Design a binder for these strands. Structure first.
Ligand SMILES: [Mg+2]
Ligand SMILES: [Mg+2]
Ligand SMILES: [Mg+2]
Ligand SMILES: [Mg+2]
Ligand SMILES: [Mg+2]
Ligand SMILES: [Mg+2]
Ligand SMILES: [Zn+2]
Ligand SMILES: [Zn+2]
Ligand SMILES: [Zn+2]
Lengths: 56, 144, 178, 37, 220, 129, 63
RNA sequence: CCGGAGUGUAAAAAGCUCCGGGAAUAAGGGCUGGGCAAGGCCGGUGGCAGCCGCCGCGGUAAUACCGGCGGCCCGAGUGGUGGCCGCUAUUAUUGGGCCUAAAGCGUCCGUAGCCGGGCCCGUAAGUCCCUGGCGAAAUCCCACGGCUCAACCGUGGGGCUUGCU
RNA sequence: GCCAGUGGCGAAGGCGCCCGGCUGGAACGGGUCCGACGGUGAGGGACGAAGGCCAGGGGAGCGAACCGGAUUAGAUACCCGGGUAGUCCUGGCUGUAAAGGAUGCGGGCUAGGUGUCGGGCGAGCUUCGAGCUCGCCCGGUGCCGAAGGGAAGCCGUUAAGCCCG
């Protein structure tokens, strides 16, 4: 099977047609930040799991 | 707010309020006070027997144009006059005066009137112990 | 306030669903049924099996274990499930399996009748034996152990191999899906 | 009186103030012919 | 599918990838924020959606606009498509003629394709195989409030005809429903069912529940 | 006025989980709130909880992990024998062993699962799924 | 964590000495009464709606 | 089905076993515009007659009345009337609503009632567990047996009785 | 009267010239006291706009009824001229209103932004003013607004959202 991605903030299993986004950690690389729609629209800060760069 | 009594020891007042507003339920009220039985000339029956007093005709509401045939009928169990509609095409001719006739409900939503006939609640079914459907379709001629 | 014997068949919630009608029309022609009543009877048999199985999934021991065992051994005995079976398999079962366990159908099989309609007539006119016993009810559900003992009656002309219709039926020795 | 804003509307109605006044005149006549005449 | 693939030139980044042989699975399509503006993408990666069966027209309404010079009628068409595993989409289309409206509705449906979770979560099957949904779920649109419950195997779809169609296209064979509101509003009923099937994804789980409920996110 | 700190705590958790908060604070702490959180931790719905102490009833700091859909109090604290949990599950949870009903028993505050495997009933006070 | 967790006072107790006797005396910054020196009867803080106005603290401390 | 013999029966009849004759002796009721399965058919009437559970059809081309042909549903039954449950989350504990749709007392005060902050100790009334005695039989579920199977009956297991103790 | 405001006080009704006296309630500040004393409230009570009534006073303006002049096909009205009750005071009764935020009260949670009233704090400026400006806290009162909610309009930390009554 395939894996379902998970937000780095909410940990809540991104859905198919969610206005989500994914991008590598700045200041770390080597880590895919996933970010759900709720988190984006509510300015929920994230934090890279490898590094600790916080970000919006 | 959150509804009335939700407490663990509030069943009394809860029961009470449900009863209070069941009385706002009109079906329950009719059933429990027996209003139909008090105002029904058929006295809680599905059918009734009556004597035809006269043959009449009734105009359909507004958009439809027709003279629905009917009869004023005196019911025997109470001596009460009700008007009954004679389904079929020559039914009013197959029916005569002083004839014994059986009286069903016409259908209709609340045991009431049906269709473009404004104020008629009853059907004729039998005429001198013979079905009006058969009289109308020709079979089973009338005794009297 | 007494017993009042109740029907053992359930009628459908709506009488005029095109899907159900088509499906049932096909089944009734395939299995040569006189009545939707008969079909619904077997459907209701199945439904009751299923409901018991459901309850016993969502049940607890010392009883509801007895009934689990009883359900499974009943269905084994009827030939609807194998002996290594489970409630999951109950829920997998079908009305077609039930109708296949009818006598009419087994006689259309066992190469005895050439047609389910002729099987019906044989049963009803008294030419089929099950374990030596004449049965005239085509809806009789045969047990998996009685199945191999089905035969023409001894007091049946069809038991004489010289009989014309017997000769035709054995001119077409066929079975399988019925 | 108990009243009804529904009745206060005018889509297919007469004005409720005046319906009310009519009702009260009737009631007065009835009260009048009941108790003393 | 090779057939549409030949005729098709992509016009989108996603379509370029699909044509290029990249993103070969609809699961790779979805959970990425991507923008699907191409039923050709969906037909390529999910060819069974091109089929008249696996397509379902659920409602046709003649809607009116008034003008000086009288009435101008439009046709709203609610259609659904799906692979009878776990993919389904729902679309509305408008036209001056029913056929235009239908083809448009089906295109928008393929664009509104979603991916659902299937399983077994009823107290009285526990079969660990994806005939139902794995947990009760709720959806809404308008006044309609659809609550889908997992059912046992062989139950069927205990729901109105619209839900029957959509859930069949999504691969759900067995379900119980409780509904509120005006289900005689087909659009909002359908969208409520659809949104419930998406809320299957919105719901969270623990590690072993996948195995015990038989959870399946697309094909099995 | 204030009634059931437990319900308030659970509703707070629920709303904070909806908005994706990582930590909540539950202000009128109780031994019962603590037991319920002990259970929720053990069944893996929250992360880490610690009792902060003021001069008042005390606070709980509660670190969440995104594994709650609905957490709530069964407020008519319903007596439940050891063979009715099926029904209360069907009322409060979406699938057959999905979430957790928290039960107060004579042998402590437990889940309905542990209560079943102990053959003991009690009073339902909360659900979490 | 900030500004409502463990609501803490903004007021302070503070040590002052009168100008007349010079006795160090603890007081409250937000008094409800005119505070008088225990020895001289001198007003050390005059009350207000909030933070009292301080007389006679030229050598001061706050705890 | 017809006739006959045995058994059956308190006697008889039915049933059962057998003989003989012969596909003979045996299918309707409702519907047919949509709800709702089934007619771009025909003839008649022509806002009349009539149908119509509701929507609605009918005023000269009527798939909606009457009839013929056809077809659909059920079928030894099928329709009509009344009643109860369901539909109805239109009585809402589960599980409804109260700005504008029915609906927040004009506002406040307070009696009963209901709801009630946190810790410790106790009691053990509710609550939970286990166990004793009861809650008739029939009825309900299941299996197994006997009437050809079944229904029915019996054996056994379980449940039911609001429970009380 | 102007000042006079999405201003303030009040349970609501409602409350505007100034001065003095009596008096109610709230906010803020508070390492003050008491120590759950709380919420809601069936029934019950109190307050309660205008109008009306009883009695007694007063009566400028306005003014139901009424009286006249016009208008109009008519005009039991709208317009004009007058005018009784009434509007004011005292003491009582009445106890109704689109008495409306058409939104019962309490408590907890769920982004905020921008005003404004009051108190407080901290800074800066000052004509050194019970002054001005900025920020922060509390409490009020408004607009906007993401998420969210809803049939929608619209609501949206002053919820019509989630929860506890
Ligand atoms: Mg019809
Ligand atoms: Mg009603
Ligand atoms: Mg309602
Ligand atoms: Mg209203
Ligand atoms: Mg018994
Ligand atoms: Mg707005
Ligand atoms: Zn997130
Ligand atoms: Zn990084
Ligand atoms: Zn001094």
């Amino acid at each position: 099977k395939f894996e379902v991605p998970v937000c780095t903030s909410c940990g809540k299993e991104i859905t198919p047609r969610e206005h989500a986004t994914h991008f590598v950690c700045p200041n770390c690389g080597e880590a895919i930040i996933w970010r759900c729609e709720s988190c984006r629209v509510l300015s929920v800060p994230y934090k890279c799991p490898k590094c600790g760069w916080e970000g919006p | 707010g959150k509804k009335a009594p939700y407490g663990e020891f509030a069943g009394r007042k809860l029961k009470l309020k449900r009863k209070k507003f069941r009385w706002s339920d009109i079906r329950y009220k009719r059933r429990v006070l027996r209003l139909k039985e008090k105002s029904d000339p058929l006295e809680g029956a599905p059918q009734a027997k009556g004597i035809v007093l006269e043959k009449i005709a009734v105009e359909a509401k507004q958009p439809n144009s027709a003279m629905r045939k009917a009869v004023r009928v005196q019911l025997i169990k109470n001596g009460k006059v009700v008007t009954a509609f004679t389904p079929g095409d020559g039914a009013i001719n197959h029916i005569d005066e002083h004839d014994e006739v059986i009286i069903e409900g016409i259908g209709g939503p609340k045991g009431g009137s049906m269709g473009d006939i404004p104020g008629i609640r009853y059907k004729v079914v039998k005429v001198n112990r013979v079905s009006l459907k058969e009289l109308v379709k020709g079979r089973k001629e009338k005794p009297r | 306030d007494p017993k009042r014997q109740r029907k053992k068949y359930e009628t459908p919630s709506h009488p005029w669903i095109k899907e159900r009608l088509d499906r049932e029309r096909v089944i009734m022609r395939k299995y040569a049924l006189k009545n939707k009543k008969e079909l619904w009877r077997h459907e209701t048999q199945l439904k009751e099996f299923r409901r018991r199985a459901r309850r016993l999934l969502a049940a607890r021991g010392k009883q509801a274990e007895v009934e689990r065992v009883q359900l499974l051994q009943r269905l084994n005995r009827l030939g609807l499930l194998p002996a290594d079976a489970v409630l999951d398999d109950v829920l997998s079962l079908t009305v077609e399996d039930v109708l296949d366990r009818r006598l009419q159908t087994i006689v259309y099989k066992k190469g005895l009748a050439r047609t389910p309609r002729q099987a019906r007539q044989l049963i009803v006119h008294g030419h089929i034996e099950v374990n030596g016993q004449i049965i005239r009810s085509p809806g009789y559900l045969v047990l998996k152990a009685e199945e191999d003992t089905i035969t023409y009656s001894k007091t049946s002309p069809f038991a004489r191999e010289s009989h014309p219709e017997r000769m035709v039926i054995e001119q077409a020795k066929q079975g399988g899906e019925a | 009186m108990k009243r009804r804003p529904r009745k206060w509307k005018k889509k297919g109605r007469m004005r409720w103030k005046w319906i009310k006044k009519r009702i009260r005149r009737l009631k007065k006549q009835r009260r009048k012919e009941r108790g003393l005449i | 599918s090779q057939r549409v693939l030949e005729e098709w030139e992509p016009r989108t980044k996603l379509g370029q990838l699909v044509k290029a042989g990249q993103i070969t699975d609809i699961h790779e399509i979805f959970r990425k924020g991507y923008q699907i503006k191409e039923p050709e993408i969906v037909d390529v990666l999910l060819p069974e959606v091109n089929m008249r069966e696996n397509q379902e027209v659920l409602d046709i309404a003649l809607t009116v606009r008034m003008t000086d010079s009288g009435r101008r009628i439009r046709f709203r068409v609610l259609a659904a498509v799906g692979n009878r595993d776990g993919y389904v989409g729902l679309g509305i289309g408008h036209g001056r003629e029913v056929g235009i409206a239908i083809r448009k509705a089906i295109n928008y449906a393929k664009m509104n394709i979603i991916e659902i979770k299937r399983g077994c979560g009823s107290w009285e099957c526990r079969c660990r195989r994806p005939h139902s949904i794995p947990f009760a779920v709720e959806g809404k649109e308008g006044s309609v409030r659809v609550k889908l419950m997992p059912g046992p195997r062989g139950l069927g779809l205990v729901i109105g005809d619209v839900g029957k169609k959509i859930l069949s296209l999504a691969g759900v064979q067995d379900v119980w429903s409780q509904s509120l509101g005006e289900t005689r509003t087909t659009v909002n009923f359908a969208k409520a069912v659809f949104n419930a099937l998406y809320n299957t994804n919105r719901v969270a789980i623990q590690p072993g529940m996948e195995e015990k409920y038989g959870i399946v996110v697309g094909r099995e | 006025t204030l009634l059931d700190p437990l319900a308030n705590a659970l509703s707070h958790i629920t709303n904070s989980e909806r908005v994706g908060k990582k930590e909540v604070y539950l202000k009128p702490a109780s031994k019962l709130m603590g037991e319920v959180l002990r259970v929720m931790q053990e069944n893996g719905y929250i992360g880490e909880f610690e009792f902060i102490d003021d001069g008042r009833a005390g606070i709980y700091r509660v670190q969440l992990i995104g594994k709650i859909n609905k957490a709530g109090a069964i407020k008519p604290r319903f007596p439940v024998k050891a063979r009715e949990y099926e029904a209360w599950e069907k009322r409060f949870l979406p699938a057959f062993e999905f979430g957790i009903l928290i039960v107060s028993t004579s042998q402590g505050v437990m889940t309905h699962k542990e209560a079943i495997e102990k053959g003991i009933g009690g009073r339902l006070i909360a659900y979490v799924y | 964590l900030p500004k409502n967790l463990i609501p803490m006072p903004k007021s302070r107790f503070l040590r002052v000495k009168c100008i007349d006797c010079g006795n160090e005396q603890i007081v409250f910054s937000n008094p409800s009464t005119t505070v008088r020196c225990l020895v001289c009867g001198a007003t050390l803080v005059e009350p207000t709606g909030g933070k009292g106005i301080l007389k006679a603290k030229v050598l001061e401390v706050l705890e």
